[PDB]
Design an enzyme around this catalytic site. Structure first.
Site, PDB file in Angstrom:
ATOM      1  CG  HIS A   1       5.366  -5.101 -11.319  1.00 50.15           C
ATOM      2  ND1 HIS A   1       6.033  -6.154 -10.720  1.00 50.15           N
ATOM      3  CD2 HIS A   1       5.267  -4.094 -10.424  1.00 50.15           C
ATOM      4  CE1 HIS A   1       6.305  -5.765  -9.482  1.00 50.15           C
ATOM      5  NE2 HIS A   1       5.869  -4.535  -9.253  1.00 50.15           N
TER       6      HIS A   1
ATOM      7  CG  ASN B 228       7.043  -6.938  -5.504  1.00 52.88           C
ATOM      8  OD1 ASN B 228       6.658  -7.280  -6.619  1.00 52.88           O
ATOM      9  ND2 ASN B 228       7.031  -5.657  -5.158  1.00 52.88           N
TER      10      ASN B 228
ATOM     11  CE1 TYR C 114      -2.100  -3.589  -6.834  1.00 49.41           C
ATOM     12  CE2 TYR C 114      -1.703  -5.271  -8.506  1.00 49.41           C
ATOM     13  CZ  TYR C 114      -1.253  -4.504  -7.440  1.00 49.41           C
ATOM     14  OH  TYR C 114       0.016  -4.589  -6.984  1.00 49.41           O
TER      15      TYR C 114
HETATM   16  C1  HEM Z   1       3.427  -4.867  -1.367  1.00 45.70           C
HETATM   17  C2  HEM Z   1       3.228  -3.960  -2.290  1.00 45.70           C
HETATM   18  C3  HEM Z   1       3.049  -4.316  -3.726  1.00 45.70           C
HETATM   19  C4  HEM Z   1       3.299  -5.448  -4.427  1.00 45.70           C
HETATM   20  C5  HEM Z   1       3.938  -6.711  -3.969  1.00 45.70           C
HETATM   21  C6  HEM Z   1       2.898  -5.200  -5.769  1.00 45.70           C
HETATM   22  C7  HEM Z   1       3.170  -6.105  -6.783  1.00 45.70           C
HETATM   23  C8  HEM Z   1       2.749  -5.929  -8.065  1.00 45.70           C
HETATM   24  C9  HEM Z   1       3.016  -6.827  -9.081  1.00 45.70           C
HETATM   25  C10 HEM Z   1       3.806  -8.109  -8.877  1.00 45.70           C
HETATM   26  C11 HEM Z   1       2.387  -6.318 -10.202  1.00 45.70           C
HETATM   27  C12 HEM Z   1       2.308  -6.882 -11.591  1.00 45.70           C
HETATM   28  C13 HEM Z   1       1.371  -8.063 -11.618  1.00 45.70           C
HETATM   29  C14 HEM Z   1       1.510  -8.765 -12.937  1.00 45.70           C
HETATM   30  O1  HEM Z   1       2.553  -9.626 -13.074  1.00 45.70           O
HETATM   31  O2  HEM Z   1       0.688  -8.566 -13.838  1.00 45.70           O
HETATM   32  C15 HEM Z   1       1.758  -5.116  -9.826  1.00 45.70           C
HETATM   33  C16 HEM Z   1       1.061  -4.284 -10.663  1.00 45.70           C
HETATM   34  C17 HEM Z   1       0.463  -3.094 -10.273  1.00 45.70           C
HETATM   35  N1  HEM Z   1       0.484  -2.593  -9.048  1.00 45.70           N
HETATM   36 FE1  HEM Z   1       1.512  -3.263  -7.518  1.00 45.70          FE
HETATM   37  N2  HEM Z   1       2.287  -4.016  -5.918  1.00 45.70           N
HETATM   38  C18 HEM Z   1       2.359  -3.438  -4.717  1.00 45.70           C
HETATM   39  C19 HEM Z   1       1.837  -2.215  -4.346  1.00 45.70           C
HETATM   40  C20 HEM Z   1       1.098  -1.452  -5.186  1.00 45.70           C
HETATM   41  C21 HEM Z   1       0.406  -0.345  -4.725  1.00 45.70           C
HETATM   42  C22 HEM Z   1       0.518   0.204  -3.321  1.00 45.70           C
HETATM   43  C23 HEM Z   1      -0.354   0.131  -5.785  1.00 45.70           C
HETATM   44  C24 HEM Z   1      -1.266   1.352  -5.775  1.00 45.70           C
HETATM   45  C25 HEM Z   1      -2.104   1.584  -4.730  1.00 45.70           C
HETATM   46  C26 HEM Z   1      -0.087  -0.770  -6.861  1.00 45.70           C
HETATM   47  C27 HEM Z   1      -0.625  -0.649  -8.086  1.00 45.70           C
HETATM   48  C28 HEM Z   1      -0.335  -1.536  -9.117  1.00 45.70           C
HETATM   49  C29 HEM Z   1      -0.904  -1.355 -10.453  1.00 45.70           C
HETATM   50  C30 HEM Z   1      -1.842  -0.280 -10.883  1.00 45.70           C
HETATM   51  C31 HEM Z   1      -0.360  -2.290 -11.172  1.00 45.70           C
HETATM   52  C32 HEM Z   1      -0.621  -2.604 -12.614  1.00 45.70           C
HETATM   53  C33 HEM Z   1      -1.522  -3.843 -12.613  1.00 45.70           C
HETATM   54  C34 HEM Z   1      -2.131  -4.201 -13.927  1.00 45.70           C
HETATM   55  O3  HEM Z   1      -2.048  -3.373 -14.965  1.00 45.70           O
HETATM   56  O4  HEM Z   1      -2.683  -5.262 -14.016  1.00 45.70           O
HETATM   57  N3  HEM Z   1       0.787  -1.764  -6.488  1.00 45.70           N
HETATM   58  N4  HEM Z   1       2.010  -4.841  -8.510  1.00 45.70           N
END
Ligand code: HEM
Ligand code: HEM
Lengths: 679, 681
Positions: free
Chosen positions: B67, B140, B354
């Site tokens: 993202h 999402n 996160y």
């Molecule tokens: C339903 C499943 C998921 C959704 C809806 C989701 C949604 C998102 C969204 C919308 C962001 C960006 C947030 C922003 O606008 O700053 C994000 C970032 C991220 N997500 Fe996911 N995510 C999902 C699953 C995962 C999973 C399973 C992992 C790892 C276990 C993960 C790891 C991350 C990481 C590391 C970031 C970067 C966040 C940051 O640098 O602040 N996500 N995710």
């Protein structure tokens, strides 16, 4: 092989079981849970060690030139240049020095489009036996600013607005055009960026320039002023803005793939290393100061002298470890070369070393496989984040009795050490001013413009008209036109028309009709093809595929890679009609009996979007690409209004189409298909 | 009535009417380097140059691991009533309670500079600045995720993102690695169908529906829990582009969605979203034909109606993208009293991930001290030191238990100090294992329920996306593996894709085949509840007095709520964009002004101002992309030059009364699906 030194750090995981970063075989596909439908446990070291690595994969992108691509290569010297320089990679006949080049844009971020309009980068690393030597250049011989202190101002202005971060990889905004109108030094590089140099066909069809004036020191200490040049063996070729805009969307990795494909296919790109030799006493003799990065030296005053050739034969194995992690510095100098009092160069030496600490989080960035020299490192440097080595020497200071004097000091007389030019002197008051010899900002922009073809000059004005029409501030537009009027009254009046403002007042101060060679892109003819990208618009019905395959075989014979386009992936189909586009190819040829799909019922297929084949042909012609039709395929050209014989357009039998379309590519882009003012 | 950014005032810096200073104060001149003479070398003793360049050289921070490409806005969340009966949450604790918010919308595979209109899953992440802590719903635009276990996240991302050897392609899933993963991990098939649909290429961030995906729990004061599913329903309505349009837009304007949001807030028309929930009893967790702990499955509206809790409107744009949008660090672990987690294996691993990632992006633990991250609730804990400590803590006894600090900061729980508590009923039973429940084994029923719930033309857009994407796979075996998986969902879907690939798809597998249909999954069925913030392009000319007639059309349209841009050869009296600068991707409605037919035929088309055949192209593009096209008076000749009927569905011809009201009608429909070819003709 150039990559030989990287073989020791290369990891294979084939035929191996999954392990943790600290060893031990594991299963990283299921989380440890408290029951069948239970919560994940903190004691799951496998999950944490896998996700911790992933969570921390990204490093900061380069502050400038974030978007780019590299390749490994071999530099060969044409002879012993000991008479002109003490450099090791040059003072021998047929001496093979490993290289690595990273080409890039400027304003664009990591994910920005390859085909964006910008100054292009041309950073080259020489893995000499006397240290790493970098020529961190650009595809334009001139830079925007004269003092390195103004670099943040230029970058902040050209890059996206700080409030919304709009626009990406573009100079079509208020801030960028306010800077050019407020800093008239920026006007030369603007004219170059507004030309074909701003939107080139490929990294291989680019000329490189070191920009700054440098010095070439001999063993004895005698110096000579020098200008680095990289002349492409492939020849200079550029796209058209209307094509470039569509390509940025259809394939943002256009140049990145162009290079990758060339090396894999065997046709490796080449560049000749040329120099402009100038006597120390003739530094202001040519009507401008040679310490000025806003001015270039014409070929008529100083001919180019070839020193050797650099060819890129190997692609990287890991983009991150190699291309992303490479840290160039113009301060990566060796014995034989020296800096000049160029205020832009002076500030770069500091900046590039400093930035490395942000990008790499420590000082051992030079220990990284891609950065480390072949020459060997023996100094008193110790500790620091991520120390990769174990120093045997416990007496890590100098002078010292305990270490018998090792590592020893090397200079001019002993140990082939680096030395500054002995003749170099400091004279005068310490000041924060710029030389009066830097005051001319309008003569050189006009010399370039006067040295371009009538249609090329239009492209320059058709870029400014486009870009300036985006400025919301009325006063910025007037300020721009006032500056443009100081270069040429013709250039100013033509741009003024598109803006709706009328401000023509001829200022004949810096007006001249002088012309210089080797600045034009299309004027010269393409040497080898070797380019190539030929699209064959065919169809699955009527036995057109069989006739298209025959054309594909005969055309590839001259060293090409032709892509056959049809409704679906049949026997000889490489790309479909929904996947293919005119931006992807340099020559568009319609195969015999290709329907009825251009305007008839065949145009309405669920396989491709409405009117696609017709669009590929339409686009090609309007973008000046040589278009062709075999036999019956003449009706395809007629559906849009394209005459049989004009420019590149050739009709007839199979062999009658092949010969002529090959000649079209030598011209590359048909300038007669573009409207010039006054008609 | 109030400014949602009031708390960031304290940190705003005005430099108007001030002289240039160094970071450590003192007036300076940062335009000339200190040199040893007139044409001399720069001196190390030039502190001005070094302090200016050091700051610049260290401007960039790492982008988000996923993202990376996106844009945010500040807002105000208002509760529709007192939901204390369903949840102990503070922000849902009273009627008309105003809670400050900040939403960041994004893609997934795309890097920092990638195009906004690429085919990806979109992010929709909301921060609730509650008077009880920061509450994040990191969701999402698709209700289902690709994988079932968070441990597989690196595998999915590594596969969808650019190839590791050359870093090709950017912001796309059309490559061997991505399609090998989908064919090897059948759980990924539901989100694929959603990504391949209109949900993958939406019109704007404002025309998106958001989903929390996981199942959560809503705890009352007493400890009673209820399973919950978060939903964000757009008051603007769901609207999506077409792939052929989306590809051209990625090049013409890579900041399409970024500008769309920015413009809306500045123009006054602020976007709104209703916060809806699906309430489910703890005992009915496997009662609906699937496990509610499964992120690959969503709950149909027929089994559980949506209940609105309040409304969120984005009224303020940021002042500095970096400090606010780039630096915001969301976490689904940002939970408050009233809400609790479920045993969803995807959610479980997210809570760790996160928090961890922030250490890379921010290079320390005090990322929560940053103005955009800081809560409004107040911070009182024994956390000390750490990179870039912004605070001077007054309590010298930074530990618990303690006699010296009189017991402060005090412990809070369920009964005391309104503290957070886990659901009391939550139990752990069974063996500790590295397996997944048998209730997660169904990966083909749910993809088919979505597909069966789309309009005939919408179904083709799904088919074509797969046809497009799969045609990029170089491996013959990967294409067969994909078609084998697609055949398990629907034999019709599999045979239609097979045609484009040149290879046939055997053999009908009726195991997970059904004709069940669910509501609220289609983007193109329901018409837009409003026509405001919809861009309309007026193709006019500088000759024949067409400009004057175009300005009249622009006036009547702008007073309706629409954003009108007049296109001509040059920037005249009422011209906003030129013909070289303008494109059909920029607009939703393309209208040719009376007397502009002159730049379609003859020499009028051959102008040095714009590229050959541009006006014709804008009109051609708009019709083929299903946008409502219009012509005023004589402008009928413009449509005729390409072969467009004046009485066709979507096409409008007549006067400056008929066009104005006729076009705005077609905008409610947005995209005319009748212009798109469906298989079977
Ligand atoms: C339903 C499943 C998921 C959704 C809806 C989701 C949604 C998102 C969204 C919308 C962001 C960006 C947030 C922003 O606008 O700053 C994000 C970032 C991220 N997500 Fe996911 N995510 C999902 C699953 C995962 C999973 C399973 C992992 C790892 C276990 C993960 C790891 C991350 C990481 C590391 C970031 C970067 C966040 C940051 O640098 O602040 N996500 N995710
Ligand atoms: C003739 C003028 C200039 C040229 C030709 C030039 C060219 C380049 C190129 C080609 C790169 C990217 C190298 C790569 O591929 O890794 C680069 C990076 C950079 N340049 Fe320049 N540059 C110029 C002037 C400046 C100036 C004046 C400054 C500041 C004083 C500056 C600061 C940087 C920095 C900080 C980077 C990032 C380098 C890194 O992260 O490794 N450049 N420049």
């Amino acid at each position: 092989d150039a990559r030989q030194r990287l073989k020791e750090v290369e990891v294979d995981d084939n035929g191996q079981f999954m392990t943790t970063d600290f060893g031990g075989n594991i299963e990283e596909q299921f989380s440890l849970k408290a029951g069948g439908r239970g919560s994940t446990l903190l004691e799951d070291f496998i999950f944490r060690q896998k996700l911790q690595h992933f969570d921390h994969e990204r490093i900061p992108e380069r502050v400038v030139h974030a978007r780019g691509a590299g390749a490994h290569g071999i530099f060969t010297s044409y002879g012993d240049w000991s008479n002109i320089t003490a450099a090791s990679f040059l003072g021998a006949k047929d001496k093979q020095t490993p290289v690595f080049v990273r080409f890039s844009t400027v304003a664009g971020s990591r994910g920005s489009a390859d085909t964006a309009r910008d100054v292009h980068g041309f950073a080259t690393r020489f893995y000499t036996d006397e240290g790493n030597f970098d020529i961190v250049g650009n595809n334009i011989p001139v830079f925007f600013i004269q003092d390195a202190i103004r670099f943040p101002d230029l970058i902040h202005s050209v890059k996206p607005s700080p409030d919304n971060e709009v626009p990406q990889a573009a100079t079509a905004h208020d801030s960028a055009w306010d800077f050019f109108s407020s800093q008239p030094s920026a006007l030369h590089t603007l004219f170059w960026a507004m030309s074909g140099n701003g939107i080139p066909r490929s990294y291989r069809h680019m000329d490189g320039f070191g920009i700054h004036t440098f010095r070439l020191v001999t063993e004895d200490g005698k110096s000579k002023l020098v200008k680095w040049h990289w002349k492409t063996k492939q020849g200079k070729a550029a796209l058209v803005w209307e094509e470039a805009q569509v390509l940025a969307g259809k394939n943002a990795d256009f140049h990145r793939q162009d290079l990758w494909d060339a090396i894999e296919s065997g046709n490796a790109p080449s560049w000749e290393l040329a120099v402009q030799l100038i006597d120390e006493d003739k530094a202001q003799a040519y009507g401008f100061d040679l310490l000025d990065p806003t001015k270039f030296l014409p070929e008529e005053f100083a001919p180019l002298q070839v020193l050797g050739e650099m060819t890129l034969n190997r692609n990287p194995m890991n983009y991150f470890a190699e291309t992303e992690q490479i840290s160039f510095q113009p301060g990566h100098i060796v014995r034989g070369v020296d800096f000049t009092e160029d205020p832009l160069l002076q500030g770069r030496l500091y900046s590039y070393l400093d930035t490395q600490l942000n990008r790499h989080r420590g000082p051992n960035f030079e220990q990284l496989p891609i950065n480390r020299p072949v020459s060997g490192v023996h100094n008193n440097h110790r500790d620091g984040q991520g120390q990769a080595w174990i120093h045997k020497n416990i007496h890590h200071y100098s002078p010292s009795y305990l270490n018998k004097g090792y590592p020893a000091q090397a200079n001019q007389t002993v140990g082939r050490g680096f030395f500054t030019t002995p003749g170099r002197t400091a004279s005068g008051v310490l000041n924060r001013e710029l030389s009066a010899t830097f005051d001319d900002h309008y003569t050189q922009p006009r010399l370039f413009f006067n040295s371009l073809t009538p249609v090329e000059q239009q492209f320059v004005i058709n870029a400014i008209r486009f870009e300036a029409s985006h400025v919301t501030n009325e006063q910025v537009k007037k300020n721009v036109l006032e500056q443009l009027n100081k270069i040429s009254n013709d250039v100013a009046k033509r741009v003024a028309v598109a803006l709706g403002l009328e401000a023509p007042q001829p200022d004949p101060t810096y007006y001249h009709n002088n012309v210089t060679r080797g600045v034009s892109i299309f004027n010269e003819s393409l040497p080898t093809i070797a380019t190539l990208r030929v699209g064959v618009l065919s169809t699955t019905k009527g036995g057109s595929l069989d006739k298209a395959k025959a054309l594909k075989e005969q055309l590839e014979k001259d060293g090409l890679k032709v892509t056959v386009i049809a409704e679906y992936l049949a026997s000889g189909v490489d790309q479909t009609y929904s996947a293919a586009d005119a931006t992807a190819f340099d020559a568009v040829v319609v195969a015999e009996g290709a329907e009825r799909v251009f305007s008839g019922k065949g145009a309405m297929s669920p396989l491709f979007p409405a009117g696609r084949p017709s669009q590929i042909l339409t686009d090609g012609y309007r973008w000046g690409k040589p278009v062709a039709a075999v036999g019956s395929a003449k009706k395809a050209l007629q559906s849009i209004g394209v005459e049989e014989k004009e420019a590149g357009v050739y009709a007839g039998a199979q062999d009658e189409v092949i010969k002529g379309v090959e000649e079209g590519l030598k011209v590359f882009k048909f300038l007669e298909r573009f409207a010039v003012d006054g008609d």
